[PDB]
Design an enzyme around this catalytic site. Structure first.
Site, PDB file in Angstrom:
ATOM      1  N   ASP A 181       0.820  -1.220   0.000  1.00 47.64           N
ATOM      2  CA  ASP A 181       0.000   0.000   0.000  1.00 47.64           C
ATOM      3  C   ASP A 181       0.853   1.269   0.000  1.00 47.64           C
ATOM      4  OD1 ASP A 181      -2.549  -1.250  -0.044  1.00 47.64           O
ATOM      5  OD2 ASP A 181      -3.188  -0.426   1.875  1.00 47.64           O
ATOM      6  N   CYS A 215      -2.477   0.476 -13.548  1.00 50.84           N
ATOM      7  CA  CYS A 215      -2.565   0.504 -12.097  1.00 50.84           C
ATOM      8  C   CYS A 215      -3.707   1.450 -11.765  1.00 50.84           C
ATOM      9  CB  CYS A 215      -1.221   0.892 -11.481  1.00 50.84           C
ATOM     10  SG  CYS A 215      -0.337   2.298 -12.276  1.00 50.84           S
ATOM     11  N   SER A 216      -3.580   2.320 -10.765  1.00 50.70           N
ATOM     12  CA  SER A 216      -4.699   3.249 -10.569  1.00 50.70           C
ATOM     13  C   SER A 216      -4.657   4.414 -11.559  1.00 50.70           C
ATOM     14  CB  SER A 216      -4.739   3.768  -9.131  1.00 50.70           C
ATOM     15  OG  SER A 216      -6.000   4.413  -8.924  1.00 50.70           O
ATOM     16  N   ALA A 217      -3.521   5.129 -11.655  1.00 45.39           N
ATOM     17  CA  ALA A 217      -3.397   6.216 -12.643  1.00 45.39           C
ATOM     18  C   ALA A 217      -2.769   5.782 -13.978  1.00 45.39           C
ATOM     19  CB  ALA A 217      -2.564   7.368 -12.060  1.00 45.39           C
ATOM     20  N   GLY A 218      -2.146   4.621 -14.041  1.00 43.87           N
ATOM     21  CA  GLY A 218      -1.506   4.192 -15.279  1.00 43.87           C
ATOM     22  C   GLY A 218      -0.154   4.833 -15.605  1.00 43.87           C
ATOM     23  N   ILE A 219       0.593   5.291 -14.595  1.00 39.99           N
ATOM     24  CA  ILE A 219       1.886   5.915 -14.847  1.00 39.99           C
ATOM     25  C   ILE A 219       2.982   5.447 -13.902  1.00 39.99           C
ATOM     26  CG2 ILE A 219       0.897   7.960 -15.931  1.00 39.99           C
ATOM     27  CD1 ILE A 219       1.296   9.526 -13.324  1.00 39.99           C
ATOM     28  N   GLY A 220       2.634   5.044 -12.682  1.00 38.79           N
ATOM     29  CA  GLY A 220       3.665   4.699 -11.704  1.00 38.79           C
ATOM     30  C   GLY A 220       4.158   3.259 -11.714  1.00 38.79           C
ATOM     31  N   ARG A 221       3.434   2.349 -11.024  1.00 37.92           N
ATOM     32  CA  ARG A 221       3.717   0.914 -11.184  1.00 37.92           C
ATOM     33  C   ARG A 221       3.733   0.510 -12.661  1.00 37.92           C
ATOM     34  NH1 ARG A 221      -0.484  -1.055  -6.385  1.00 37.92           N
ATOM     35  NH2 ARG A 221       0.179   0.583  -4.893  1.00 37.92           N
ATOM     36  N   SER A 222       2.792   1.039 -13.447  1.00 37.36           N
ATOM     37  CA  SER A 222       2.717   0.670 -14.854  1.00 37.36           C
ATOM     38  C   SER A 222       4.000   1.063 -15.576  1.00 37.36           C
ATOM     39  CB  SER A 222       1.512   1.348 -15.523  1.00 37.36           C
ATOM     40  OG  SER A 222       0.263   0.828 -15.086  1.00 37.36           O
ATOM     41  N   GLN A 262       6.561   7.659 -10.680  1.00 35.39           N
ATOM     42  CA  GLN A 262       5.936   8.735  -9.895  1.00 35.39           C
ATOM     43  C   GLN A 262       6.774   9.257  -8.731  1.00 35.39           C
ATOM     44  OE1 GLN A 262       2.076   6.561  -9.256  1.00 35.39           O
ATOM     45  NE2 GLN A 262       1.173   8.587  -9.570  1.00 35.39           N
TER      46      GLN A 262
END
Ligand SMILES: O=C1CCCc2nc3c(cc21)C(=O)CCC3
Length: 282
Positions: A181, A215-222, A262
């Protein structure tokens, strides 16, 4: 510089935040006018994360062709990816329309539906074989075929049917379930094992449309996922693997979608993953 020793040099000097801010300063800025039209406000999860006009995915609809999704096309590596936000209640049908129209084989999900006590994306796939989903706005049917639950990730086989033509296709859902998290994983070992499972399935290969990753925004983990994949592929292709410059690759990818990676912790984790992965490849 090489990667592994540039890495220790940033650790010893504690300058990860300064390296990461340099990237943010140098990153491309292109217009995202379609994303900001008023009719698309409920198609965007976050007001500060938008697809560039020049690289956005267009739905094959004449009313409204907009979805928060971008085509990242890596020319030297010969890989393409679609990066998108976690679907919203009013975009689940658009999401599966994109998967159909772009001929994708796989969907990669790097978040849980609930994290930190809040909803991070819609429940957009069926959880029981006998309870299928119908998306009436885009005329698609989605059925759960099988599910394999492991300690760090789950793989699902899904059937997507275009109800207009009665054509059907098999889609693979690769769900990484253990990203914490807060922060990043302590070791990249399970993330790398997951990447190799996606690869082995064929979902990243040229005989299919681009993989859809979110992912949630599509930029970090992704961003971490596609950056590590592309860097490892370049190290296999080139005569001199130490020439692969992860900061340059990240800036190239940021020509196609804003904000990839991010935090400075995600940047450090991406270095760690590529470094460890390059030892297992051989
Ligand atoms: O999971 C890992 C970690 C180290 C790198 C690596 N390399 C390969 C695999 C798996 C991994 C495969 O199973 C097939 C191709 C080679």
């Amino acid at each position: 510089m090489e990667m592994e020793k540039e890495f220790e040099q940033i650790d010893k000097s504690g300058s990860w935040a300064a390296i990461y801010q340099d990237i943010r300063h140098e990153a491309s800025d292109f217009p995202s006018r379609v994303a900001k039209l008023p009719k698309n406000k409920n198609r965007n999860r976050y007001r500060d994360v938008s697809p560039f006009d020049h690289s956005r995915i267009k739905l094959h609809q004449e009313d409204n062709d907009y979805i928060n999704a971008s085509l990242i096309k890596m020319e030297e590596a010969q890989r393409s990816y679609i990066l998108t936000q976690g679907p919203l209640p009013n975009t689940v049908g658009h999401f599966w329309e994109m998967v159909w129209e772009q001929k994708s084989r796989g969907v990669v999900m790097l978040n849980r539906v609930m994290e930190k006590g809040s909803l991070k994306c819609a429940q957009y796939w069926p959880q029981k074989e006998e309870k299928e989903m119908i998306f009436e706005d885009t005329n698609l049917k989605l059925t759960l075929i099988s599910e394999d639950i492991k300690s760090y990730y789950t793989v699902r086989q899904l059937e997507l049917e275009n109800l207009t033509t009665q054509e059907t296709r098999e889609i693979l859902h690769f769900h990484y379930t253990t990203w914490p998290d807060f922060g990043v994983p302590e070791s990249p070992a399970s993330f790398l094992n997951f990447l190799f499972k996606v690869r082995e399935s064929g979902s990243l290969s040229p005989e299919h449309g681009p993989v859809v990753v979110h992912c949630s925004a599509g930029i970090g983990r992704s961003g971490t996922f596609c950056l590590a994949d592309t860097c490892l592929l370049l190290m296999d292709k080139r005569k001199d693997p130490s020439s692969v410059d992860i900061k340059k690759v990240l800036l190239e990818m940021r020509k196609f979608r804003m904000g990839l990676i991010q935090t400075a912790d995600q940047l450090r984790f991406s270095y760690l993953a590529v470094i460890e992965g390059a030892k297992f490849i051989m």
